[PDB]
Design an enzyme around this catalytic site. Structure first.
Site, PDB file in Angstrom:
ATOM      1  N   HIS A  46       2.790  -2.742  -0.965  1.00 60.72           N
ATOM      2  CA  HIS A  46       3.425  -3.454  -2.083  1.00 60.72           C
ATOM      3  C   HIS A  46       3.925  -2.515  -3.154  1.00 60.72           C
ATOM      4  CE1 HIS A  46      -0.515  -3.504  -4.442  1.00 60.72           C
ATOM      5  NE2 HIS A  46       0.378  -3.200  -5.365  1.00 60.72           N
ATOM      6  N   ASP A  97      -1.396  -4.764   3.647  1.00 64.90           N
ATOM      7  CA  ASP A  97      -0.859  -4.036   2.454  1.00 64.90           C
ATOM      8  C   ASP A  97      -1.314  -2.597   2.572  1.00 64.90           C
ATOM      9  OD1 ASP A  97       0.333  -3.568   0.056  1.00 64.90           O
ATOM     10  OD2 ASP A  97      -1.223  -4.616  -1.178  1.00 64.90           O
ATOM     11  N   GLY A 196      -1.653  -0.821 -11.753  1.00 73.38           N
ATOM     12  CA  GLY A 196      -1.486   0.657 -11.687  1.00 73.38           C
ATOM     13  C   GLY A 196      -2.574   1.293 -10.835  1.00 73.38           C
ATOM     14  N   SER A 198      -3.337   0.063  -7.844  1.00 77.60           N
ATOM     15  CA  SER A 198      -3.066  -0.272  -6.422  1.00 77.60           C
ATOM     16  C   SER A 198      -2.760   0.990  -5.599  1.00 77.60           C
ATOM     17  CB  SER A 198      -1.887  -1.224  -6.265  1.00 77.60           C
ATOM     18  OG  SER A 198      -2.198  -2.475  -6.869  1.00 77.60           O
TER      19      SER A 198
END
Ligand SMILES: [Cl-]
Ligand SMILES: [Cl-]
Ligand SMILES: [Cl-]
Ligand code: NA
Ligand code: NA
Lengths: 245, 13
Positions: A46, A97, A196, A198
């Site tokens: 993502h 993801d 931030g 991720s």
């Protein structure tokens, strides 16, 4: 990271800081990642799905500060930006993801291990810690949900793995959580991942080995009751990692 | 468009 503690890169030397260069020429932080071999960093799809051009990105290893250089750091271009073809649920509860970045310096080289740059081990398949285990997360994400700025100094915190039964309760996330995800949170809900963080690592110790159990992926809010962090369950993606690396 | 904490580097939301 909400709550937690400041740290330097020596305490998470696989941590990769990923930035994007814009039209203006301005460079902004995107997401974390983890160095899993000298030429490969693993992160979350993502972080890149809206801007999949590898040329736009810069990756640092050995970096403890967001906007200032750390002595010993290494800078890389992205030779290949590999997103997971089955990515979905971009609106919230992201599936598959996970992303790979093949890194290459200006001199054509990969990571060189040092006191500040080291790889992290992958889990063996389907082999995760039991729920209730304490693990660590690392990132440059927001310190408060309401903040506008990201911290200049790297942070870490400790969260506990939550059972899939607990996370799939309707008052948690219901069916948004899948077997390919892990939830983790603080018992008081006072520390958590945030915007931030991720792409960064959830590291747990199994049989004495520090292992990349998860990749920071999604969650409602940050540090809210009944709303854990949700992480890509790396131990369910080994064939995909193996076949793209 | 993207909701929650996992929405870095998005065009919209
Ligand atoms: Cl799926
Ligand atoms: Cl879980
Ligand atoms: Cl939200
Ligand atoms: Na340092
Ligand atoms: Na490699």
């Amino acid at each position: 990271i909400i709550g937690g503690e400041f740290t330097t890169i020596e305490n998470q030397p696989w941590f990769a800081a990923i930035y994007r260069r814009h039209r203006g020429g301005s460079v902004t932080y995107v997401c974390g990642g983890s160095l899993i071999s000298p030429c490969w960093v693993i992160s979350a799809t993502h972080c890149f799905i809206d801007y999949p051009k590898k040329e736009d990105y810069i990756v640092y290893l050995g970096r403890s500060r967001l906007n200032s250089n750390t002595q010993g750091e290494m800078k890389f271009e992205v030779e290949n930006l590999i997103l997971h073809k089955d990515y979905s649920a971009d609106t919230l509860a992201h599936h598959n993801d996970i992303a790979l970045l093949k890194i290459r310096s200006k001199e054509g080289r990969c990571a060189q291990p040092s006191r500040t740059i080291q790889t992290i081990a992958l889990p063996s398949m389907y082999n995760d810690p039991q729920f209730g285990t304490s693990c660590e997360i690392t990132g440059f994400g927001k310190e408060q949900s309401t903040d506008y700025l990201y911290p200049e100094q790297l942070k870490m915190t400790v969260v506990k793995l939550i059972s899939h039964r607990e996370c799939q309760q309707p008052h948690y996330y219901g069916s948004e959580v899948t077997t390919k995800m892990l939830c983790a949170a603080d018992p008081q809900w006072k520390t958590d991942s945030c915007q931030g963080d991720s792409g960064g690592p959830l590291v747990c110790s199994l049989q004495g080995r520090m292992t990349l159990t998860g990749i920071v992926s999604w969650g409602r809010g940050c540090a809210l009751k009944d709303k854990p962090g949700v992480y890509t369950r790396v131990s369910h993606f080994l064939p995909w990692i193996r076949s793209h690396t | 468009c993207c909701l929650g904490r996992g929405c870095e580097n998005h065009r919209c939301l």
